[PDB]
Amino acid sequence: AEYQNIFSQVQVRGPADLGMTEDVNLANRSGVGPFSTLLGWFGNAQLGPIYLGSLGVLSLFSGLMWFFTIGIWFWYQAGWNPAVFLRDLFFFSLEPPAPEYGLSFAAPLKEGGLWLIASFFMFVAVWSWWGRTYLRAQALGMGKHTAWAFLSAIWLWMVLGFIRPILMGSWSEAVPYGIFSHLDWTNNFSLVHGNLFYNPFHGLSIAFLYGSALLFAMHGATILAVSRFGGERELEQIADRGTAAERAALFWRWTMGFNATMEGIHRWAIWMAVLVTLTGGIGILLSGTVVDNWYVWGQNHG
Amino acid sequence: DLASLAIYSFWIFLAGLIYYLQTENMREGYPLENEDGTPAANQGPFPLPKPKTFILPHGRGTLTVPGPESEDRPIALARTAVSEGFPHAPTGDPMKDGVGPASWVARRDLPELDGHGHNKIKPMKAAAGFHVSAGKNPIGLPVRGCDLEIAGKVVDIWVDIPEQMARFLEVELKDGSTRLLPMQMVKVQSNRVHVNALSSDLFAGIPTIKSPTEVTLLEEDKICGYVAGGLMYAAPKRKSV
Amino acid sequence: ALLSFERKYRVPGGTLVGGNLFDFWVGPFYVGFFGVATFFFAALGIILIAWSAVLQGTWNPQLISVYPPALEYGLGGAPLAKGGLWQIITICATGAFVSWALREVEICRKLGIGYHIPFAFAFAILAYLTLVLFRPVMMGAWGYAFPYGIWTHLDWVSNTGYTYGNFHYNPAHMIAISFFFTNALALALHGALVLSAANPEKGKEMRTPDHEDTFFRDLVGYSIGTLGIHRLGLLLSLSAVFFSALCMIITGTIWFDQWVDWWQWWVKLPWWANIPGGING
Ligand code: BCL
Ligand code: BCL
Ligand code: BCL
Ligand SMILES: CC[C@H]1c2cc3[nH]c4c(c3C)C(=O)[C@H](C(=O)OC)c4c3nc(cc4[nH]c(cc(n2)[C@@H]1C)c(C(C)=O)c4C)[C@@H](C)[C@@H]3CCC(=O)OC/C=C(\C)CCC[C@H](C)CCC[C@H](C)CCCC(C)C
Ligand SMILES: CC[C@H]1c2cc3[nH]c4c(c3C)C(=O)[C@H](C(=O)OC)c4c3nc(cc4[nH]c(cc(n2)[C@@H]1C)c(C(C)=O)c4C)[C@@H](C)[C@@H]3CCC(=O)OC/C=C(\C)CCC[C@H](C)CCC[C@H](C)CCCC(C)C
Ligand SMILES: CCCCCCCCCCCC[N+](C)(C)[O-]
Ligand SMILES: CCCCCCCCCCCC[N+](C)(C)[O-]
Ligand SMILES: CCCCCCCCCCCC[N+](C)(C)[O-]
Ligand SMILES: CCCCCCCCCCCC[N+](C)(C)[O-]
Ligand SMILES: CCCCCCCCCCCC[N+](C)(C)[O-]
Ligand SMILES: [Fe+3]
Ligand SMILES: [K+]
Structure with a gap:
């Protein structure tokens, strides 16, 4: 090869x-x-x-x-x-x-x-x-992007362990520390709330998690693919577009019809990730506080 | 219902966000051009963003995108059809002209500097305390082209100091001059370095560097482009294996 | 219309099939033989779905669902309204996805880049072909595959998982999940790191990669580097999918009971097998 x-x-x-x-x-x-x-x-x-x-x-x-x-x-x-x-x-x-x-x-x-x-x-x-x-x-x-990005993770964690149990009246509603027990918690949470596949926020969360795998596969592949032109040197490519930025952009333009800039891909990156736990956090916070059963909710909200 | 307020708001935001994201990614190569270089008619529903300005380090000015877009170099191609959407044939030698997969961008004719104002990339002879640390050292190995002929000998690795990685092999040619081969387009092997993109005879053609202990961004693009184009434009001389 | 820097790249060449016959673009999209292959396959794929839609009796995208054949049919063909269409729509889908990949290889060839993207995509195609070909063939019926519908496919996911108890206990699937989450962590961080460098505090000059390393080494004691991280995202995300495929290829074939019970192998290794106390003694 x-x-x-x-x-x-x-x-x-x-x-x-x-x-x-x-x-x-x-x-x-x-x-x-x-x-x-x-x-x-x-x-x-x-x-x-x-x-x-x-x-x-x-x-x-x-x-x-x-x-x-x-x-x-x-x-x-x-x-x-x-x-x-x-x-x-x-x-x-x-x-x-x-x-x-x-x-x-x-x-x-x-x-x-x-x-x-x-x-x-x-x-x-x-x-x-x-x-x-x-x-x-x-x-x-x-x-401060890292700190702001991290806050998204912190949010989901905070909802699961602190905000939701506080709004529900009991610490008992929180996740236990245990490998298998927390998987059982997760499953029985979905069962008790009507199957979380019916929660639109859970749905989005999945779209972004998968989408994160899609994006980073695309992105990582793309930089590796243009690394013979200096691609990974993204910051100097941001300040002084090179044939590497151009070939990367045009690969995508010719494949799917539109494309990123070399700084811009990183805004798609930061957001695709960050929106996993952001949406997910909302999904869970609403579960059992506002909505007891997502199947039932679904029936009455499209 | 609060779930409904939440979800509906979110889609609004995601719409705004995608809008934002998409306009941010039009900071370069826009507005769209027809094949003759003039401004295209239909641009698309997204406007060009309000411009932003980067302050480059090391006194190197600023860059303020989006702005007046120009190749700042002439393009040796000619239409092959009478209407939009067809390929543009090289009018001379695509490799010597820098077109197609031989394309290079007209980036600055200075070297990328590191976080302390020092050339990012130096020949390893000039980069104090750098040495090969694992893997086969290619310095001394002969270089072979896809025509299975000897193009030269490797005479140094050109390293990225701050990132401590190999970026080029400097290769000495029949006549004593040297050329940088991007490290990503070479195969260091037990007993040779094999370059598949180029045949032995196209090595002279690699763009040279004005100064022997530094590469400018411009020269990097020219060399990288030249070498890649070989894949396409040297395939006649590329023997199977 | 073309990007400001695009024409120089639109030279002739790099096709795998048909020479110049289809070496042109429509708007921004490269056509090529595999453009035509893809269009053909998507088109007929979509008609045949609209066809299935007509016979279910619905046009709503939340209701349209093309179901594979009843397990009765084994690995044979079922008639059009009762299993066939799914069978032929799967022939179109795989046609279309594989053609798209080969089109990406033609674009790479014209552009003189590496073939990483299309190789990467190939992993996604394989996950798909595990759920609709390798797994249904090994089990013995096209019925074990998922059906094409927005909600009905999620119905299949739940059903299929619960057939094996809480699917969490699938160990390949634990590895899969950890890769998806770590990938997402890596994207967050990479996005954030480059942007924090491009976009430093107000009035300050752009930072350098040395600042990106110094950042991370300050924070966690290590920096993988800018080549590293791109290798990493590609590796994480492709790993996530490979284990996804694996965790299903083994389920219902080599392991087909409750996944929770699989872990008894460890609980019963003979040295601790019978020691009292703990959860399991
Ligand atoms: C999200 C919905 C559910 C849930 C559902 C699931 C499901 C379903 C699964 C997991 C899985 C995992 N979950 Mg859980 N999980 C939840 C919330 C959490 C929380 C939390 C604090 O909120 C934590 C910590 C975990 C932890 C974990 C891991 C045990 C495991 C893989 C995680 C991963 O990929 O991390 C990201 C990856 C990382 C690498 C970060 C970790 C790095 C560490 C901290 C650094 C090591 C440093 C080293 C010790 C240095 C020493 C140096 C000195 C010199 C000595 N879960 C919530 C409640 N979770 C999976 C599993 O396999 O379980 C067995 C699985 O299948
Ligand atoms: C039978 C189980 C239910 C179900 C129950 C739940 C529940 C309950 C939840 C999810 C959630 C999620 N589920 Mg679900 N899920 C199901 C089916 C699926 C399927 C599928 C193929 O069927 C998929 C792909 C997913 C995917 C997902 C994710 C999109 C989402 C979690 C995002 C994340 O990154 O969390 C990981 C990130 C974190 C946990 C943040 C952690 C950050 C902190 C600060 C880290 C601490 C570090 C620590 C101190 C050190 C490490 C130590 C060691 C690791 C031990 N689910 C079925 C329907 N799922 C979560 C969600 O968002 O729902 C809306 C959630 O709460
Ligand atoms: C109750 C349900 C069970 C469960 C049952 C199952 C079952 C059953 C499965 C999974 C699978 C997965 N589950 Mg599980 N799982 C559960 C709980 C979870 C939780 C959680 C937080 O609790 C998480 C995070 C996950 C995570 C995951 C992932 C590892 C994996 C899904 C990704 C994948 O396969 O991608 C692979 C990606 C693809 C297949 C995408 C294919 C894309 C193709 C190539 C192209 C299509 C293009 C398209 C047509 C284009 C359209 C037009 C354009 C848009 C223009 N599960 C619960 C407990 N899970 C799946 C898996 O591993 O499959 C192999 C699987 O089958
Ligand atoms: C978009 C949301 C995604 C996300 C984002 C995200 N996570 C983040 C960040 C961001 C943007 C960070 O900046 C932060 C980080 O620092 O990453 C490097 C973080 C982080 N995400 C983490 C984990 C994590 N993230 C997860 C998820 C996600 N994070 C999402 C997918 C998950 C799960 C469950 O999937 C996990 C497990 C941590 C790696 C890190 C936050 C670290 C933290 O909070 O640490 C406090 C805990 C400790 C200090 C205990 C650890 C100590 C060690 C055992 C070392 C001991 C050293 C000692 C000196 C030796 C002792 C030996 C003897 C003397 C005893
Ligand atoms: C391998 C790691 C990840 C990955 C990678 C990946 N995907 C890729 C690529 C890469 C590297 C591309 O280059 C390519 C692309 O163009 O991206 C923009 C692609 C792609 N990944 C895509 C989607 C996708 N990827 C996913 C996942 C992943 N992709 C992984 C997480 C998922 C899911 C479910 O998580 C989806 C939905 C497409 C956007 C794009 C491929 C587009 C393509 O092949 O188009 C040609 C075909 C058509 C346009 C029409 C097909 C119509 C069929 C004939 C009928 C439909 C049949 C279908 C099976 C029914 C679906 C019903 C559903 C309700 C379930
Ligand atoms: C209610 C608090 C919720 C925070 C999430 C807790 C789940 C983490 C489980 C990890 C397993 C713990 N341990 C010790 C086995 O590693
Ligand atoms: C920042 C990248 C944007 C990614 C695109 C996300 C598309 C959403 C998919 C819809 C599924 C959600 N829902 C509500 C139907 O459950
Ligand atoms: C999920 C849908 C994604 C499809 C994105 C395709 C965008 C291609 C746009 C090409 C048309 C060019 N335009 C807008 C200037 O006319
Ligand atoms: C998360 C889904 C991705 C949605 C993609 C939306 C972007 C479409 C941009 C098309 C216009 C760009 N164009 C043709 C002017 O170059
Ligand atoms: C995937 C995470 C990587 C950590 C360990 C990597 C070890 C691989 C070394 C292979 C390359 C060696 N060699 C001589 C063949 O080039
Ligand atoms: Fe990047
Ligand atoms: K030295």
């Missing part, structure tokens, strides 16, 4: 790349980590360095406090036996308080409290990480 440029043929290495400074507090950056020749065939071999200020410490620590609130429960559920822990790992589940305790924090560690503790810790972990996604942009002088 011609090279397909999925893996590289020759790897080069030079001095460790410590990064642009702009306004970043370098006191809070780490040193380079190892380089991985293996990663090198596909992407960059360099690991690190990592910026880790006071908000990162808060986020990771809080993040671990989560993964060990659950863990403790799981080991406990295994009766401390590692053989059982490993065997039943996917069956263990930290479950939220019963419906009888409503929105109260008054519920016993063994039957809800540990769930609330883990939820507290996760809420601190994610939000703190959010601030990070902003501040790291800020310190470099860059746009």
Whole structure:
């Protein structure tokens, strides 16, 4: 074959790349980590360095406090036996308080409290990480698209675990921490709400999730396809259109009749993704708060 | 009903959003032209956006799209039909003229700079502390064309410093001069580098670089274009294998 | 009408079939032999659907549904109103999708680009051909395929999944899902990263790729790079689909019971198989 440029043929290495400074507090950056020749065939071999200020410490620590609130429960559920822990790992589940305790924090560690503790810790972990996604942009002088994009994910998560259960009167309505239990939660949610295939927002959510696979396949294929003309260098192609931008645009124009610009594809990209969890979040928030049965709703709303 | 307000609003927004998205993607190559280069009649329902201005780094001006669109270079083609929609035949050598898959855009005649104002791409001899780190090192390997003839020898890899990757092989020719072959159009093999796009005799033809330790964006486009066109325009001399 | 930069590219050449016979465009669209193949197949595909519509008795796109043949028919042909049309509309669809791919290869050839797009698309065609050919052939009837309707196809998806309990427990399908979600994460991030560079804080100059890496290395300790990420999206999204195809090709053929029960293999490995305590002892 011609090279397909999925893996590289020759790897080069030079001095460790410590990064642009702009306004970043370098006191809070780490040193380079190892380089991985293996990663090198596909992407960059360099690991690190990592910026880790006071908000990162808060986020990771809080993040671990989560993964060990659950863990403790799981080991406990295994009766401390590692053989059982490993065997039943996917069956263990930290479950939220019963419906009888409503929105109260008054519920016993063994039957809800540990769930609330883990939820507290996760809420601190994610939000703190959010601030990070902003501040790291800020310190470099860059746009806030990442933070705004992330907020879309955060939305769906917030609806599932915090907003919807609050608007329904009980923590019991939230998802449990557990591999199989959360899949069972998901299924029984749809069953209880009339089959979520009847929820128009769920429908859109699917259109965008699939569409994200469609778009990134198109886009990634397209850049790889024009990489013999410098395609991946998208920012300098934005500032100074090259034959790579033009051949990419014209492939698509001649195939489907219309086309992107080199900055513009990334606006289709950011939105196709972001609209998955945006629509989905709306879908769920309405479920059981405004609409009990989406089949039934469907019958009376086209 | 709130679900109905929600869904109906959303479709409105998605409409507006698609509108926005589509106009943002008309920032380049519009307005549409007829084949003679004049402004076309039917443009489409979407207007050209209000223009935006990029501030380029490193003192390199700005770019303000959409704007007055021009190839800024002459196009050696001629109609083959008496009406719209047919191919335009090269009037000379498409490869030497830069047309079709040999096309190049008239980008700036300076090199892409990295985040510290330094040429993004340098020959590896000039890029301090860069070396081949895995894979077969091609420096020294002979270069072979699709006519199964020796075109040259590889004499250096030209690397992207900030991205630490190979971007070209610099290849020395029968007469001592060198040429950049885009790395994506070569096959490094145990005992040779094989270039399939070009035959041995078309290598001299590759656009050269005014300065031996840098490539400008213009020259990149010319070389990349030249090499790609070979696929089409050198297929007579392309032996099967 | 043509893009401001387009004519130079509209040279003759690159067809796979018919030489110059169909080497022209209509408006922005390249025709070519495979344009004509596609038009032919879509056209007849659509007529035959309107034909199925007439005989169901409806013209509403939310009601029109071309159903495959009753399982009775096995892998044979059924008559037109009772299974055939779906059979022939599937011959048109695959014709049309495969022709579209080969048209994309002609466009690539004219444009001197790589063939990544059409190869990628091929994966989507295969997922489709798993649901309507490989899976129905291996099971033994055209009936196991999904029917062409906006809602009726979703009816089939639910039915089919529930036949195996909660389909979540299909392990190929867990891998599939994780790829779709990660892909969507990767798109979000890539979109956002380039745009944050193109579109920096007010008054500030465009950023550089070094800023994109520095961003991500600051955030998560790694940067895959600008070639990397395009390799990544392509890999994630094509992986998502390949596992989608796999998770169905195995279902109802090599595994046909409740997927939840499949996981007993792990629960019963002989070392922990009988240790008391836990969920399963
Ligand atoms: C969306 C509707 C349902 C739901 C339905 C489903 C279904 C259906 C499925 C999943 C599946 C998954 N779900 Mg779920 N899921 C929901 C909500 C969630 C939430 C959440 C917090 O809201 C989480 C965290 C998960 C988590 C997961 C994963 C367990 C699994 C694959 C996820 C994935 O692709 O991630 C994105 C991919 C990533 C790579 C991000 C993760 C990266 C991590 C955090 C980084 C690793 C760093 C490493 C440790 C560094 C160490 C360095 C030091 C030096 C030591 N689900 C909601 C409630 N989910 C699938 C599964 O296979 O389950 C078994 C599946 O089939
Ligand atoms: C039988 C089951 C029901 C059903 C029940 C549900 C329910 C319930 C939900 C979905 C939702 C979705 N379903 Mg559904 N779904 C069904 C059938 C399908 C089918 C199909 C082929 O049949 C498909 C393709 C989908 C697809 C989808 C998605 C479009 C959507 C989730 C988007 C997403 O990215 O979430 C993933 C993204 C997140 C969860 C955001 C997470 C962000 C946070 C901040 C990350 C935390 C990181 C953590 C701290 C670290 C990681 C740790 C490790 C991974 C453990 N469904 C059937 C009808 N589905 C969701 C939705 O939007 O509905 C409207 C939802 O709530
Ligand atoms: C109750 C129902 C069951 C269930 C039962 C099933 C069944 C059954 C199936 C899936 C399949 C899938 N499910 Mg499951 N699944 C469930 C829950 C979920 C959840 C969730 C969040 O709970 C998620 C995220 C998913 C995710 C998924 C995906 C991995 C996969 C669908 C994508 C795919 O196959 O694309 C592949 C893409 C295609 C087939 C698209 C083909 C496009 C072709 C090539 C071109 C057509 C062009 C067109 C005609 C052009 C029109 C004209 C133009 C517009 C001009 N499932 C629930 C529990 N799921 C499917 C699968 O894996 O199939 C292989 C499948 O069959
Ligand atoms: C359009 C919506 C899509 C989306 C978007 C999205 N997600 C995002 C973003 C965006 C735009 C981010 O910016 C953010 C990000 O940073 O990505 C790199 C994020 C993110 N999306 C994530 C996950 C995620 N996203 C998902 C989904 C989606 N995200 C959607 C498809 C999903 C699912 C369920 O499908 C998951 C699981 C995270 C990778 C990241 C947010 C990270 C976060 O909030 O972290 C807080 C948690 C922790 C700090 C705990 C982790 C700690 C580790 C175990 C390391 C420990 C280090 C320690 C020093 C060592 C300890 C060893 C011993 C001493 C004990
Ligand atoms: C492999 C990864 C992903 C992917 C990739 C992908 N798709 C692609 C490409 C690529 C790389 C293209 O180049 C090509 C394109 O042109 O994109 C703009 C394409 C394409 N992906 C498309 C759709 C599509 N992709 C999907 C999915 C995916 N595509 C994956 C997630 C899905 C779904 C369900 O998720 C759909 C609907 C088309 C927009 C386009 C292919 C267009 C095409 O082949 O057109 C020729 C045929 C016609 C115009 C008419 C066909 C009419 C038939 C004769 C009758 C209809 C039969 C049909 C089966 C009935 C459907 C009923 C439904 C209610 C279920
Ligand atoms: C898909 C994620 C990739 C991570 C690991 C990649 C390893 C592949 C290496 C293959 C290329 C090696 N070689 C010598 C054949 O070029
Ligand atoms: C009600 C809170 C909802 C947030 C989503 C929680 C679901 C995540 C389940 C992941 C599995 C947990 N664990 C420990 C097994 O990894
Ligand atoms: C930003 C890209 C735009 C993507 C196009 C989305 C098309 C929507 C498909 C409609 C299905 C939804 N519904 C309500 C019928 O369930
Ligand atoms: C799902 C529908 C997508 C179809 C998009 C096709 C757009 C092609 C437009 C070609 C006509 C040119 N125009 C508008 C200037 O007349
Ligand atoms: C998410 C679905 C995609 C919808 C596509 C809508 C864009 C059509 C743009 C056609 C006009 C462009 N044109 C012909 C002037 O070049
Ligand atoms: Fe890109
Ligand atoms: K050196």
